[PDB]
Scaffold this active site. Structure first.
Site, PDB file in Angstrom:
ATOM      1  N   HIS A  91      -8.349  -4.304  -1.257  1.00 47.19           N
ATOM      2  CA  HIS A  91      -7.120  -3.709  -0.778  1.00 47.19           C
ATOM      3  C   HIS A  91      -6.748  -4.268   0.598  1.00 47.19           C
ATOM      4  O   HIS A  91      -7.618  -4.711   1.351  1.00 47.19           O
ATOM      5  CB  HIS A  91      -7.239  -2.187  -0.702  1.00 47.19           C
ATOM      6  CG  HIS A  91      -5.918  -1.499  -0.663  1.00 47.19           C
ATOM      7  ND1 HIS A  91      -5.096  -1.427  -1.766  1.00 47.19           N
ATOM      8  CD2 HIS A  91      -5.258  -0.877   0.344  1.00 47.19           C
ATOM      9  CE1 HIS A  91      -3.989  -0.784  -1.442  1.00 47.19           C
ATOM     10  NE2 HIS A  91      -4.069  -0.426  -0.173  1.00 47.19           N
ATOM     11  N   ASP A 141     -10.544  -2.485  -5.769  1.00 48.89           N
ATOM     12  CA  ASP A 141      -9.585  -1.623  -5.068  1.00 48.89           C
ATOM     13  C   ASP A 141      -9.423  -0.328  -5.850  1.00 48.89           C
ATOM     14  O   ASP A 141      -9.048  -0.361  -7.023  1.00 48.89           O
ATOM     15  CB  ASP A 141      -8.256  -2.363  -4.957  1.00 48.89           C
ATOM     16  CG  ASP A 141      -7.177  -1.592  -4.227  1.00 48.89           C
ATOM     17  OD1 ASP A 141      -7.364  -0.424  -3.845  1.00 48.89           O
ATOM     18  OD2 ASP A 141      -6.098  -2.184  -4.050  1.00 48.89           O
ATOM     19  N   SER A 177       0.842  -1.206   0.000  1.00 50.10           N
ATOM     20  CA  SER A 177       0.000   0.000   0.000  1.00 50.10           C
ATOM     21  C   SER A 177       0.884   1.267   0.000  1.00 50.10           C
ATOM     22  O   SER A 177       1.673   1.433  -0.925  1.00 50.10           O
ATOM     23  CB  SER A 177      -0.981  -0.023   1.176  1.00 50.10           C
ATOM     24  OG  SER A 177      -2.022   0.902   0.957  1.00 50.10           O
TER      25      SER A 177
END
Ligand SMILES: [Mg+2]
Ligand SMILES: [Mg+2]
Ligand SMILES: [Mg+2]
Lengths: 315, 315
Positions: B284, B254, B157
């Site tokens: 995600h 996502d 991320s």
């Protein structure tokens, strides 16, 4: 979308060489074209090979090749493998490197079904041969020196179609037991107007007209293509529930992409444990084609499938 | 598209009783939500752990956690790891299971950077800490008992943002040498109107307003966001060429999907060998969240990344 660069060079070289379209060729010619592409000097995992015949299937006999990690004489788990290349093409040579990789990475015996190809054999000969060999392996484990409680099935492209249908037949017929199934970019539908068929109708590599021709070689004229034993996307949640965990691998740039991913969704909705991954930057047939064997997508997908099978069969 | 069922159960529980949106909380409160979500007793790989401090970086001291496969005292290859959770959240606890998996699967030491979080620390504190620690590991290999010629970086991320930027900084500053880089669902751009941002603006799990808030905690007001040290999608083919082979893993559902896949293409166009895979049916954060640990996508991606690192560092 934009291709990985080695893959791009392949596609451009193919365009420049200007060969005839696949559907203008005889089956023998089409076969020889793929055989010639796959006849290069390439690194291959070491295995022991036995070519033989099992006295099963609708024709009374099915040719098989049995592969094992070289020198390994253990009672191994086993993979029954159904090859792709359009129903018309493909043999032990065209898929040799791939199935050697699976055998060695999974540390399993692998039984390669050399099914009768189309158009000389049409539906349902090959799927019944496929099912019969899978059953035979499960019922002759002492002779093959395998462990029938750790039997997986796997296939690429139309061979992924065969994988799905053998799972379906095994559910309907009460066996044999399947531990896991692997489907590389499977054929699962015949809707030539969906998203990826529309977008990639003119390639790369695989075109809509080519798929139209392959399907017409496989099937008798006029047959209802919606039946689940032809297009497993139409299987009921019933036919799917209780099937073995699945790995489904798709290619970004592929007419068959959307139906493979849709089929993975159908399995998952039915309660099957589904690992489903799309590889970007690559094309259909990317784990079989020797010209792509050192590309990152091919290496990744083979390593992923090998590991998935190793875990399923030894974990 | 439809999620894997356990993943959907999680999403359904959030919609039913998830409470106020994360971005309406104080950073302390947000931190505590994730810390609590991840503090459940759960099966984890066995490791050795050392918490310490390296006297480097913009603050003069960077907290790190050093993880090794349990009992292993060999001179190992090493991974430097940059965690996610929006710049605001995350710590050695939230990402514990994930980085243990990577250490054990790669058979490598892993150096987890406990960087200073936003908004208390803005850009560029964490990326300078991240690079400093990477340099430190390369230059103190005897202290750490690692092989500095087999050093990889990895992150998830915003930690994938950090991985991309550390690669760029290493190019710019002449080292250290990086063997491979792994980016789980990276943040690479700040275009909140692209395809996947528009499609998944209100979830599942990660939302467009959340990303807007995270970016605002990270960045000073009025900063030029197009700097590649902020949005590495803007890196020149020159900042990118010469970078280590990359694994990029994205999630189907996502907001950050498209920019992750676009970044992979940018690396590939620059001549970097990029393995890029989209996992369908998931969301995600799917390799960090403990609630998803036994889902097929999480298991698949962790196994893929672990093996990719093992091959890079031991092959
Ligand atoms: Mg596909
Ligand atoms: Mg993503
Ligand atoms: Mg690539």
């Amino acid at each position: 979308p934009v291709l990985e660069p080695t893959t791009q060079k392949f596609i451009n070289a193919l365009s420049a060489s200007g060969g005839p379209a696949i559907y203008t060729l005889t089956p023998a010619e089409a076969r020889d074209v793929l055989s010639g592409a796959q006849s290069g000097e390439i690194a291959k995992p070491a295995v022991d090979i036995t070519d033989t015949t099992f006295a099963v299937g609708p024709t009374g006999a099915t040719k098989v090749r049995i592969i094992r990690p070289q020198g390994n004489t253990d009672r191994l788990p086993v993979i029954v493998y159904f090859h792709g290349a359009g129903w018309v093409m493909g043999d032990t040579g065209t898929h040799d490197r791939l199935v050697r990789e699976l055998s060695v990475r999974a540390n399993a015996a692998l039984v390669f079904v050399d099914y009768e190809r189309s158009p000389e054999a049409r539906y349902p000969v090959a799927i019944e041969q496929d099912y019969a060999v899978t059953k035979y392996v499960a019922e002759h484990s002492e002779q093959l020196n395998v462990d029938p409680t750790r039997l997986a099935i796997a296939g690429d492209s139309v061979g992924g179609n065969m994988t799905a249908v053998v799972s379906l037949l095994a559910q309907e017929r009460g066996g044999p037991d399947i531990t896991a199934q692997v489907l590389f970019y499977p054929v699962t539908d015949a809707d030539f107007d969906n998203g990826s068929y529309t977008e990639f109708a003119n390639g790369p590599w695989l075109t809509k007209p080519a798929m139209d021709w392959f399907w017409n070689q496989y099937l008798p004229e006029g047959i209802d293509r919606t039946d689940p034993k032809i297009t497993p996307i139409h299987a009921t949640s019933e036919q799917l529930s209780g099937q073995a965990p699945a790995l489904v691998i798709t290619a970004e740039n592929d007419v068959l992409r959307d139906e493979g991913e849709a089929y993975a969704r159908k399995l998952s909705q039915a309660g099957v444990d589904v690992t489903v991954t799309r590889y970007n930057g690559t094309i259909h047939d990317f784990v079989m084609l020797n010209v792509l064997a050192d590309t990152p997508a091919a290496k990744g997908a083979i390593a992923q499938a090998g590991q998935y099978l190793h875990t399923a069969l030894h974990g």
